[PDB]
Design a protein around this ligand. Structure first.
Ligand SMILES: Nc1nc2c(ncn2[C@@H]2O[C@H](COP(=O)(O)OP(=O)(O)OP(=O)(O)O)[C@@H](O)[C@H]2O)c(=O)[nH]1
Ligand SMILES: [Mg+2]
Lengths: 173, 41, 1033, 11
C-alpha cells in the first residue's frame, strides 16, 4: 500500500496491546503475557472500499522498566490508540498520563480510547465511570481481543478521520 | 560547566522593559475575523 | 554496520554527530532489523551515566530535529534523577543554557512555527528544573517570566505555554511523581504568586490582537480554572469577557465554551447570582450563533470537525450547568423562557447521530426524570410544583426515548480455542448500559404519565401499519420501546395496551408480503410477548397458543427464526415455569407432560446448540415441580433420548474401547455432555438422579480420552493439539469437568456429595492429571476442584492431603521456572490454593512442614508475577493466611518466628518495584496488618534468636538495614522517617498507601546530602499527629 | 445406590 499512516498504541502494561495487534496480524489469540521491550513496529493492511489503507502500528511498552525512548516514539505520529483494561481500575486511572505524554508531542491527531477485556464477567471499570474522553474529544470503544468484540471499530474510525471519508467501510479481500 | 552560553535570560529581559507592554492597544474599530458568524455556515 | 552503530557508546573520543543522526533516522525511518538495532543502540546510549555531558554538542551541531529531541531526553532524565548531586556550577550552567535556548528559539516566529516539538521539550525541561529548584533557589522566576512576557508576543505565547505546563505538573499530574510535602509546598508557592500571572492573562485577553497569543492565553486559563481560588473567577470580569469577546468569535468558540463549562461545574453557595448571569448571558450569546430553528442533526452530519467539537462541548456545558443549578434557574420566575430554550437546545442536540453526544444528553435526561419521579411517583392529575415546569416538554423527551431506543441484547458469534462457534450474550458492555439508561428514563416518564407514552407508541404503530413510515429498523425500535416499559403500568392498562399492540401487529403480519417481512414481524411479536410475562401468566390459552406457535417456528429454515423461537421459549420458560407443571383449567394433564411426550418431533430440525437451549428451557420447567416422586419421573422421562444414545455408546465401547477414537462417537459424547450440562444448570440438585446414573461411565470415558490425548501428544509433540480429533477429545473432557463442577455448585447436601461423588474424582481425574505429560494436562481440573472446595468446605478437609499429593507438586514444578508459560495453570492453581486456604485451612496443619514451606513459597511466587490476576490472588491468599494464623495462638508464634521476616522482606521486594504498583493497595494492607500485629505485642516470642529484644525495635533496625542495603543512595534520615511512618500509620490504610507512594518517589532520585526537599520537620509532625489520633481511638 | 456401578470399566 502507498497510503501509510503511523499509529501509536499506548497504555499500561498487561492491558492487551500486543495481543490486540497480533489478532489483526495473524488472527491468533495469545494467552501468555510477555512484556514488550521498548517498541515493536507492525504493518497492518486493511482493504476499504476506496483501496488499501496501511497502519504502521508502533506497539509500545507499558512497563516503566521497559519504556525505552518513551515520548520519542510519538514523533511524527498521525493516529493514536490509548488502551486500558476494564478489569483493572489502575489502568483507567493512568489514561490521563498517557494522554498527556501523547498530546505534548502530537498536538492534533485522532485518538481512540479502547477498554479491553470486556468479555470477563468481573468488570471493575463500569461503563458509567468512563467519562475521560468527553472533555478531550476522543473516541471510545469497548473491545475484546479474545472475542473479537468491536474488533475493527478503532481502526475504522481512525481511517475515516485520516482519509476524510465518513462513508468508508472495510471490505475483506 | 555545560555549554557556556552568551544567551539572554528572563531577568535581563524583564529589567530592560518597564511595566509598559509591547503588545497592541485594541486599535479603533477592530474585531476578530468572522465575529458573530453562525456555527453552521 | 552494527559495530559502527555501537561505536556511540565508546565515550573515549568526541561524539560523532553524523553517526548519531544516521542511527536516529534508521530508528524513525527503518524497515526491519535496522530499526531494532538503532532502537537498542539509542536506548543503551540514553541510560549511560555521564552521557548528558555530550548534549551540549548535540544541540549545537546536529541539524536533524529528532536527534536534538534525543539529547533533550537525556538531559531531562539527568535533571529528574541526579539534579541534587550535581555541583552548583553545573546546575547553574544547565539552567542558563536552557533558558537562553528557550528565549532564542521562542523569539523567532519561523522556528517556533516549524518545530513546535523541540520548543515543547525545552519548555518541559524548564518545568522540570523549576520543580527541582524553583522556590528555594529561584525566588524571582514568576516576576521575571511575567516581566519578560511584556517584551514580545511570541515570548508571551511561549511563557503562557510554560505556565500552563507548570500548572499541570504541580496541580494535575503531581500524585505519584512528587512527595506529598513537596507537592504541597509547590502548590502553596504557586498559589501565593498567582495574582501576578493573572494580570498578564487579563491584559493579553483585553489588549492583544494576535490570534495565536490570545488562543494560548485561553488554553492556559482553561488549565488554571481547575485550582485557582474562586475569587479570581466570580469577583472579576472573567465570565463577561469570555462570553462576549471570545464566545462569538469562531476561532475561540471551543476553548471559551470549555472555560465556561469548567466554571459552571463549580458547586458553591456564596456565588449564585454569578451563575444566574452565567446562564442568561451564555444563552443569549448562543441563540445568535445556533438558532433554535436549526436542524442540528443534518448540520452536524455534514460539518467540519470544529463544528462537531462545538456541538459536543455545548452538550457538555448544558448538561453540567443544568445538573448543577437547575434549582437556581427554576427559582427565578422571569428565567422560565431561558430554561425552556436551554431544554430545547438539549432536545435538538439529542437528535445528532453520535453515540457520545447522545450519552451526554441521555445522562441529563435520566437525571431530570429521576428527580421528577422522586418528587412524586404518581401520575399527573394537582401537580407537584417542580413537575409543572417541565410538563410542556416531557412528551418530547418521551418521543425521543421511544424513537431512538437501543437494542436490548448483544449477541456475538465467537469460536473458542477448540474451533467451536457459539453465540455469546455480552452482558455489561457500553451498549447494554445505553439501553438500560434509556429504559430507566422511559420507565420513569411512563410512571409520570402512562397515557401519553401509550399514545406515542400507538401513533407510531399506526404509522407502521399504514406504510407511511414502514421500515425494519423502525419496527424493531418501536418494539424494543414497547418491551422496555413492561411492568410500568397497572395490570388492566397493560392488558388493554398489549391486546391493542398485538392485534395490530398480527394484522400487519398478513398485510406485508414476502417471507422476510413476515419473519421480522413474527420475531417482533414474540419479543413483545416474552417481555410481558404477567400477561401470559394471567391468561393460559394465550400462553399455550404462544408456546405452540414457538414450537412451529422451530421447523422454520429461514435464517434467524429458530434462534428467535429458542430465545423466546427460554424466556417464557424461565418467567412462567410454574404454569407448565401444574394442571390448568380445561387441561387433563400438565403441559410439561405434553412437551415431553412429543419432544423428538419438536427438536428434529434444530441445530445442536438450539437443541441444548431447548433442553435448558424444558429443564427450567422441571425444577418448578415441588413434588419429589413426580419430579423424579419427569427427570427420568426428560433425559430419555440422551440416555439412549449414551447407553448405546457405552455398551458399544464395552466390547472394545477402540471406538472412542472414532471422531463421530466423540462428537456424540460431546453433544450429550453439553445437553447434560444445560439440563443440570436448569434443574439443580434434583439432577442427582441423572448425575449418579452416568457418573462412573463418564469418569471412565474421561480417563480413556485423557490417556489417548497424552499418548498422542507425547508421541507426536504439541502440534497435534490442533487436530480435529484431539480437539473433540479435549471438548469431551472439559464438558465432563463442567458437568461435575456445575452440579456440585448447585447441590444442597455437602455430606452426601463428599461421601459419594468426590472419592471417584481422586482416582479418575486427579491421578490421571498427575500421570499426564505437562503439555496434555487440563487446567480446568485445577478449577473444578476449587469449585468443589468452595462448596463442601469443611466436609472435604480430610481429603486435601490427597488432592495436594496429586496436583500440587506437578503443577508447581510446571509453573516455577518463569512467569510466562502456562497462564491457565497458574491462574487455576492459585485459585485452588486460595480456596483451600479460605475454606480448608486446618488441612495445612496435617501436611508435613516441608509441604507447608512449599505452599508458602508458592504463595510468595504468586505476588511476584507481572500478571495482575495471579499477583492479586497471591496477595489475597497471603492476607487470608496471615489472618487465619493469627487466630490460632498455639502455632502462631512458631509461624511468626519461621516466616515473619521472610514475608516482610518479600513484600518490601515487590513494593519497591515499579512493575507492581497496581497492587499497592494490598501491599498497604498486608504490611499494615503485620506492623500493627507487632505494635500490639501479638508476637510474644522474640523474632531475634540472638537475644531477647523488643520486637518494635528489632523490626525497625531490620527494615532500616533492609532498605538501606537495597537502595544505598538513600540518606539515613529519610529511611528512618519511612520506618517511623510504617510503625505509625499502621491503622490508616490510605495514609499508609500515600507513605508507600512517597517512598517509591524518593527511591528514584539521588538526593546526595540535600535536605531541602525532605521537609523532615513537617513530616515528623504529621506522623506524630497520626500517632496521637491512633492512640485516642 | 446413589451412584450406579460402571458398565464400562477402563483398566
Ligand atoms: N480475558 C482476556 N484476556 C486478554 C484479552 N486481551 C488480552 N488478554 C490477556 O492480557 C495479557 C496481556 O496482554 P499483552 O498484549 O501481551 O500485554 P501488553 O498489552 O503488550 O502490555 P505490555 O507488553 O507490558 O506493554 C495477555 O497475555 C492476554 O492473555 C481479552 O480480551 N480478554
Ligand atoms: Mg506488548
Amino acid at each position: 500500500p502507498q497510503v501509510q499512516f503511523k499509529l501509536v498504541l499506548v497504555g499500561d502494561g498487561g492491558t492487551g496491546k500486543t495481543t490486540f495487534v497480533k489478532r489483526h496480524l495473524t488472527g491468533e489469540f495469545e494467552k501468555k503475557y510477555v512484556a514488550t521491550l521498548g517498541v515493536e513496529v507492525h504493518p497492518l493492511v486493511f482493504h476499504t472500499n476506496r483501496g488499501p489503507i496501511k497502519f504502521n502500528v508502533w506497539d509500545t511498552a507499558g512497563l516503566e522498566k521497559f519504556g525505552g525512548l518513551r515520548d520519542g516514539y510519538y514523533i511524527q505520529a498521525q493516529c493514536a490508540i490509548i488502551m486500558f483494561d476494564v478489569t483493572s481500575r489502575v489502568t483507567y486511572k493512568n489514561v490521563p498520563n498517557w494522554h498527556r505524554d501523547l498530546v505534548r508531542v502530537c498536538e492534533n491527531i485522532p485518538i481512540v480510547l479502547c477498554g479491553n477485556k470486556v468479555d470477563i464477567k468481573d468488570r471493575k471499570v463500569k461503563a458509567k465511570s468512563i467519562v475521560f474522553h468527553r472533555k478531550k474529544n476522543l473516541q471510545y470503544y469497548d473491545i475484546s481481543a479474545k472475542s473479537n468484540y468491536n474488533f475493527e471499530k478503532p481502526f475504522l474510525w481512525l481511517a475515516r478521520k485520516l482519509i476524510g471519508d465518513p462513508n468508508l467501510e472495510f471490505v475483506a479481500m | 560547566g555545560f555549554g557556556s552560553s552568551t544567551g539572554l535570560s528572563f531577568a535581563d529581559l524583564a529589567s530592560s522593559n518597564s511595566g509598559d507592554f509591547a503588545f497592541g492597544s485594541k486599535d479603533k474599530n477592530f474585531q476578530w475575523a468572522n465575529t458573530g458568524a453562525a456555527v453552521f455556515g | 554496520a552494527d559495530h559502527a552503530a555501537r561505536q556511540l557508546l565508546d565515550f573515549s573520543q568526541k561524539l560523532d554527530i553524523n553517526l548519531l543522526d544516521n542511527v536516529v533516522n534508521c530508528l524513525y525511518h527503518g524497515e526491519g532489523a535496522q530499526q531494532r538495532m538503532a532502537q537498542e543502540v539509542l536506548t543503551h546510549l540514553k541510560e549511560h551515566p555521564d552521557a548528558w555531558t555530550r548534549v551540549d554538542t548535540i544541540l549545537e551541531f546536529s541539524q536533524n530535529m529528532n536527534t536534538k529531541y534525543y539529547g533533550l531526553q537525556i538531559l531531562e532524565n539527568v535533571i529528574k534523577t541526579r539534579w541534587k548531586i550535581l555541583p552548583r556550577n553545573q546546575c547553574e550552567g544547565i539552567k542558563k543554557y536552557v533558558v537562553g535556548l528557550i528565549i532564542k528559539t521562542s523569539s523567532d516566529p519561523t522556528c517556533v512555527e516549524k518545530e513546535k516539538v523541540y520548543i515543547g521539550k525545552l519548555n518541559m525541561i524548564l518545568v522540570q528544573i523549576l520543580k527541582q529548584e524553583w522556590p528555594k533557589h529561584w525566588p524571582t522566576f514568576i516576576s521575571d517570566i511575567v516581566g519578560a512576557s511584556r517584551t514580545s508576543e511570541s515570548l508571551c505565547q511561549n511563557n503562557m505555554v510554560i505556565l500552563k505546563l507548570l500548572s499541570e505538573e504541580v496541580f494535575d499530574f503531581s500524585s505519584g511523581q512528587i512527595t506529598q510535602v513537596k507537592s504541597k509546598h509547590l502548590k502553596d508557592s504557586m498559589c501565593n504568586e498567582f495574582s501576578q500571572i493573572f494580570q498578564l492573562c487579563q491584559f493579553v485577553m483585553e489588549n492583544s490582537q494576535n490570534a495565536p497569543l490570545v488562543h494560548a492565553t485561553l488554553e492556559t486559563l482553561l488549565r488554571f480554572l481547575n485550582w485557582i481560588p474562586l475569587g479570581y473567577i466570580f469577583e472579576t470580569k472573567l465570565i463577561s469577557t469570555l462570553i462576549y469577546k471570545f464566545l462569538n468569535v469562531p476561532m475561540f468558540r471551543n476553548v471559551s465554551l470549555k472555560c465556561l463549562t469548567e466554571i459552571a461545574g463549580v458547586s458553591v453557595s456564596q456565588y449564585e447570582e454569578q451563575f444566574v448571569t452565567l446562564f442568561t448571558l451564555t444563552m443569549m450569546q448562543l441563540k445568535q450563533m445556533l438558532p433554535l430553528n436549526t436542524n442540528i442533526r443534518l448540520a452536524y452530519s455534514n460539518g467540519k470537525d470544529d463544528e462537531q467539537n462545538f456541538i459536543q462541548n455545548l452538550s457538555l456545558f448544558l448538561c453540567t450547568f443544568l445538573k448543577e443549578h437547575d434549582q437556581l434557574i427554576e427559582k427565578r420566575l422571569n428565567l422560565r423562557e431561558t430554561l425552556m430554550e436551554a431544554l430545547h437546545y438539549m432536545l435538538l442536540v439529542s437528535e445528532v447521530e453520535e453515540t457520545e453526544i447522545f450519552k451526554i444528553c441521555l445522562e441529563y435526561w435520566n437525571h431530570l426524570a429521576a428527580e421528577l419521579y422522586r418528587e412524586s411517583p404518581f401520575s399527573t392529575s394537582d401537580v407537584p410544583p417542580r413537575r409543572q415546569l417541565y410538563l410542556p416538554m416531557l412528551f418530547k423527551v418521551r418521543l425521543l426515548m421511544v424513537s431512538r431506543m437501543a437494542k436490548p441484547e448483544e449477541v456475538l458469534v465467537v469460536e473458542n480455542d477448540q474451533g467451536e462457534v457459539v453465540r455469546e450474550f455480552m452482558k455489561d458492555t457500553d451498549s447494554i448500559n445505553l439501553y438500560k439508561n434509556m429504559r430507566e428514563t422511559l420507565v420513569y416518564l411512563t410512571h409520570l404519565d402512562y397515557v401519553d407514552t401509550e399514545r406515542i407508541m400507538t401513533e407510531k404503530l399506526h404509522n407502521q401499519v399504514n406504510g407511511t413510515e414502514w421500515s425494519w429498523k423502525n419496527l424493531n425500535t418501536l418494539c424494543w420501546a414497547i418491551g422496555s416499559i413492561s411492568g410500568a403500568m397497572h395490570e388492566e392498562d397493560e392488558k388493554r395496551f398489549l391486546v391493542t399492540v398485538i392485534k395490530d401487529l398480527l394484522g400487519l403480519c398478513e398485510q406485508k408480503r414476502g417471507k422476510d417481512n413476515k419473519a421480522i414481524i413474527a420475531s417482533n411479536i414474540m419479543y413483545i410477548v416474552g417481555q410481558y410475562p404477567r400477561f401470559l401468566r394471567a391468561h393460559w390459552k394465550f400462553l399455550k397458543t404462544v408456546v405452540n406457535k414457538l414450537f412451529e417456528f422451530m421447523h422454520e429454515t429461514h435464517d434467524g427464526v429458530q434462534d428467535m423461537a429458542c430465545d423466546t421459549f427460554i424466556k417464557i420458560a424461565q418467567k412462567c415455569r410454574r404454569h407448565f407443571v401444574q394442571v390448568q383449567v380445561g387441561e387433563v394433564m400438565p403441559f410439561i407432560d405434553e412437551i415431553l411426550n412429543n419432544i423428538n418431533t419438536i427438536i428434529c430440525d434444530l441445530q445442536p446448540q438450539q437443541v441444548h437451549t431447548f433442553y435448558e428451557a424444558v429443564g427450567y420447567m422441571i425444577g418448578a415441580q415441588t413434588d419429589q416422586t413426580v419430579q423424579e419421573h419427569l427427570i427420568e422421562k426428560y433425559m430419555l433420548l440422551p440416555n439412549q444414545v449414551w447407553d448405546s455408546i457405552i455398551q458399544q465401547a464395552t466390547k472394545n474401547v477402540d471406538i472412542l477414537k472414532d471422531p463421530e462417537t466423540v462428537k456424540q459424547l460431546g453433544s450429550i455432555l453439553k445437553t447434560n450440562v444445560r439440563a443440570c444448570k436448569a434443574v439443580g440438585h434434583p439432577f442427582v438422579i441423572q448425575l449418579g446414573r452416568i457418573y462412573l461411565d463418564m469418569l471412565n470415558v474421561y480417563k480413556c480420552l485423557s490417556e489417548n490425548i497424552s499418548a498422542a501428544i507425547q508421541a507426536n509433540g504439541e502440534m497435534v493439539t490442533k487436530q480435529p480429533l484431539i480437539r473433540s477429545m479435549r471438548t469431551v473432557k472439559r464438558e465432563t469437568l463442567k458437568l461435575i463442577s456445575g452440579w456440585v455448585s448447585r447441590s444442597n447436601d455437602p455430606q452426601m456429595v463428599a461421601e459419594n461423588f468426590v472419592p471417584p474424582l481422586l482416582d479418575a481425574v486427579l491421578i490421571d492429571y498427575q500421570r499426564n505429560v505437562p503439555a496434555a494436562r487440563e487446567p480446568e481440573v485445577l478449577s473444578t476442584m476449587a469449585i468443589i472446595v468452595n462448596k463442601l468446605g469443611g466436609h472435604i478437609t480430610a481429603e486435601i492431603p490427597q488432592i495436594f499429593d496429586a496436583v500440587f507438586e506437578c503443577t508447581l514444578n510446571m509453573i516455577n521456572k518463569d512467569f510466562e508459560e502456562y497462564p491457565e495453570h497458574r491462574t487455576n492453581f492459585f485459585l485452588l490454593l486460595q480456596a483451600v486456604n479460605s475454606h480448608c485451612f486446618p488441612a495445612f496443619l496435617a501436611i508435613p512442614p516441608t509441604q507447608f514451606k512449599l505452599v508458602l513459597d508458592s504463595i510468595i511466587w504468586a505476588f511476584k508475577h507481572t500478571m495482575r490476576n495471579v499477583a492479586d490472588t497471591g496477595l489475597q491468599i497471603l492476607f487470608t493466611l496471615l489472618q487465619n494464623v493469627a487466630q490460632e495462638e498455639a502455632a502462631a508464634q512458631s509461624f511468626y518466628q519461621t516466616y515473619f521476616c521472610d514475608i516482610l522482606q518479600h513484600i518490601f521486594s515487590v513494593v519497591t518495584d515499579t512493575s507492581h504498583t497496581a497492587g499497592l493497595t494490598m501491599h498497604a494492607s498486608i504490611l499494615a496488618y503485620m506492623f500493627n500485629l507487632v505494635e500490639e505485642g501479638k508476637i510474644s516470642t522474640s523474632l531475634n534468636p540472638g537475644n531477647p529484644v523488643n520486637n518494635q525495635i528489632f523490626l525497625q533496625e531490620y527494615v532500616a538495614n533492609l532498605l538501606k542495603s537495597a537502595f544505598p543512595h538513600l540518606q539515613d534520615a529519610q529511611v528512618k522517617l519511612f520506618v517511623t511512618g510504617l510503625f505509625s500509620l499502621n491503622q490508616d490504610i490510605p495514609a499508609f498507601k500515600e507513605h508507600l507512594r512517597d517512598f517509591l518517589v524518593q527511591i528514584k532520585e539521588f538526593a546526595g546530602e540535600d535536605t531541602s526537599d525532605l521537609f523532615l520537620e513537617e513530616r515528623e509532625i504529621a506522623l506524630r499527629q497520626a500517632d496521637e489520633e491512633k492512640h485516642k481511638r | 445406590a446413589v451412584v450406579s456401578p460402571p458398565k464400562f470399566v477402563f483398566g
